[PDB]
Amino acid sequence: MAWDLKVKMLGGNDFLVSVTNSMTVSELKKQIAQKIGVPAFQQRLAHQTAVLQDGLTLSSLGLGPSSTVMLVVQNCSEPLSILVRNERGHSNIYEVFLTQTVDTLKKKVSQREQVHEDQFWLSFEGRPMEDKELLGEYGLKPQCTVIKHLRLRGG
Amino acid sequence: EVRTIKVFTTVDNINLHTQVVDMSMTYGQQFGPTYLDGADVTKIKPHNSHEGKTFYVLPNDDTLRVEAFEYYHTTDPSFLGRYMSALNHTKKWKYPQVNGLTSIKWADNNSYLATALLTLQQIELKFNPPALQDAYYRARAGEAANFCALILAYCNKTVGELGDVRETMSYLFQHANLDSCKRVQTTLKGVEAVMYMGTLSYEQFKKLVQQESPFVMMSAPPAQYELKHGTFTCASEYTGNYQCGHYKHITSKETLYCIDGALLTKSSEYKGPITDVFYKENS
């Protein structure tokens, strides 16, 4: 069910986070980020010398209270030029950083094609990208493709 | 001495925790924002009838954050706050049942919400977070406040904001089990396999070699479109332009019924500003 899981980062720290059996590794990284301060996409977890996939569940990994995980946060620094598609088919290139919020990317594509910030939304790999969250939380690869949809403002 | 009262606090209304109040409405010190039965009471002195009553607080604990993850499948601490802020308004909304379907009397721009609710009541879909499943059951029972507030919370929207039905469905489909769906010779699977911002007509796939889904949806910008009875499950109509307007729902159950808030229109055929069309799919 629910239990504490110990996380160690190659030192005197062995801090416990309260996780569940029906929790994925990405949600674990988010919970670690909520108390460690480093964005979840920079983190990388390993149990018994085995990299944990962000989509897999802790139950599928055989993790339990009598276990410990080792964390290493990655040192991302470089930016990347990514491709943003339009709903009519147009394509543009934007140079962004994994630490920039999605709001800044919406501002960039707005200033590029002069659309209101509240007049459209965007989505990577079929997932709608939330506004106040970072880009790296969606796994934006270099030269990847991001879709842009014009939301019909109505009510 | 101090005349106190014991109450229960929870985040999922399943695991209850006993706490103490000292007849003080200053919940911001230790208690935090509290909502009795959905209506905020963070500045309400404890009544004499507030005995053995259940209160909703936000996750201040790791136990409550764990319970919130188990019930809502979320990792946002403000999620409960957003959900309760939406619920404080949706509790006062009205939910008329129209021939078996539950809509909303329009209030606070709930047009897109009512359209999404009417759509979800006519498509086969199983949610992953138990909160959404139980709210959907209660909605199909006639009380839909919790479901609509949850929808607002999952979309980061607030009561009164404008909204697009397609993006709301796209947000909802992330919390749904759609991994079984497949579509192509570009291979697709999941949420991308049930949507298309383009031709409203399913039958218009002349510009899709196979589908493997329990339902499909198509969407276009608001176009005057004629809906043929018996060809589709349900659809949504957008009267107005992109910047402002209003959403109506159309269903093809026996005849072309049209739900607008709490109003019902019967028709054999229909022609109007259609924007989304949903279709049955066995395989």
A106 and A132 together in one domain = yes
Where does a domain end: A58, A73, A88? A73
Residues B13, B80: one domain? Answer: no
CA distance B264 to B257: 7
For A18, nearest residue in chain B (alpha carbons): B62
Verify that A58 and A90 share a domain, yes or no: no
User: Are A22 and B162 a contacting pair at CB < 8 A?
Assistant: no
Q: For residue A28, what is the enclosing H or E element?
A: helix A25-36
A34 part of a folded domain: yes
B49 and B70 inside one domain: no
Q: Least CA distance to A3: which residue of chain B? A: B66
The residue among B181, B215, B234 that closes a domain is B181
Strands of the sheet containing A2-8, edge to edge, are: A14-20, A2-8, A68-73, A43-46
Q: Copy the structure tokens of residue B82.
A: 């957003």
Q: Say whether both B103 and B138 belong to one domain.
A: yes
- CATH of residue B145: 1.10.8.1190
Is A155 part of a structural domain of the chain? no
Q: Do residues A132 and A87 share a domain?
A: yes
DSSP conformation letters of chain B:
----EEEEEESSSSS-EEEEE-S---TTTTT-S-EETTEE-TT-PPPTT-SS-EEE----SHHHHHHHHHHH----TTHHHHHHHHHHHHTSS---EETTEE-----TTTHHHHHHHHHHTTS---BSSHHHHHHHHHHHTT--HHHHHHHHHHTT--TT--B-HHHHHHHHHHTB--TT-EE----EESGGGS--BS-S-STTTT----EESSEEEEEEEEEEEEEPTTS-SEEEEEEE-SSSEEEEEEE-SSS-EEEETTEEE--SSEEEEEEEEEEE---
Measured in angstroms, the resolution is: 3.2
Inter-chain CB proximity A152 and B197 less than 8 Å = no
* Domain match, B64 and B165 both: yes
Contact B243 A153 (CB under 8 A): yes
Closest CA to A88 of A6, A2, A150, A3: A150
Do B238 and B162 share a structural domain?
no
* Last-in-domain residue among B181, B199, B219: B181
Q: How many domains does chain A have?
A: 2
Give B247's contacts in chain A (Cβ within 8 Å). 154-155
Same domain, B62 and B44: no
Coil/strand/helix, residue A35: helix
Say whether both B211 and B161 belong to one domain. Answer: no
Whether A42 is covered by a domain: the verdict is: yes
Contact indicator for B173, A123 with CB cutoff of 8 Å = no
CA pseudo-torsion sign B70, B73, B79, B85? negative
Expressed as residue numbers, the domain containing A100 is 79-150
Domain match, B63 and B153 both: yes
Asked if A16 and A62 sit in the same domain, the reply is yes
Mutate to test the interface with B, among A20, A31, A86, A152 (most CBs of B within 10 A): A152
Domain boundary among B181, B203, B227: B181
Same domain, A65 and A97: no
Are residue A86 and residue A63 in the same domain, yes or no? no
Which A residues 86-115 touch B at CB under 8 Å?
87
Chain B residues whose C-beta is within 8 A of a chain A C-beta are 62-63, 65-66, 69-70, 75, 77, 109-112, 156, 161-167, 170-171, 174, 190-192, 197, 221-222, 238, 240, 242-247, 275
- Same domain for B161 and B139: yes
Q: Are residues A38 and A88 in the same domain?
A: no
Q: Residue A45: give its domain's CATH number.
A: 3.10.20.90
Mutate to test the interface with A, among B75, B117, B166, B183 (most CBs of A within 10 A): B75
- Give the distance from residue A4's alpha carbon to the nearest chain B alpha carbon, in angstroms: 10
Mark whether B66 and B20 lie in a shared domain: no
Domain that holds residue B219: 182-282
Structural domain count, chain B? 3
- Tell me, yes or no, whether B163 and B82 share the same domain: yes
Task: Say yes or no: B142 and B234 in one domain.
Answer: no
Flag whether residue A3 sits within 8 Å of chain B, measured between CB atoms. no
User: How many Å apart are CA B65 and CA B76, to the nearest integer?
Assistant: 9
User: Could you say which of A54, A73, A92 is where a domain stops?
Assistant: A73
Contacts of A130 in chain B (CB under 8 A): 156
Residue B34: burial class (beta carbons within 10 Å; 0-12, 13-18, 19+): buried
Per residue, the 3-state secondary structure of B248-277, as one string, reads: EEEECCCCCEEEECCEEECCCCEEEEEEEE
Does one domain contain both A50 and A83?
A: no
In a domain, A19, yes or no: yes
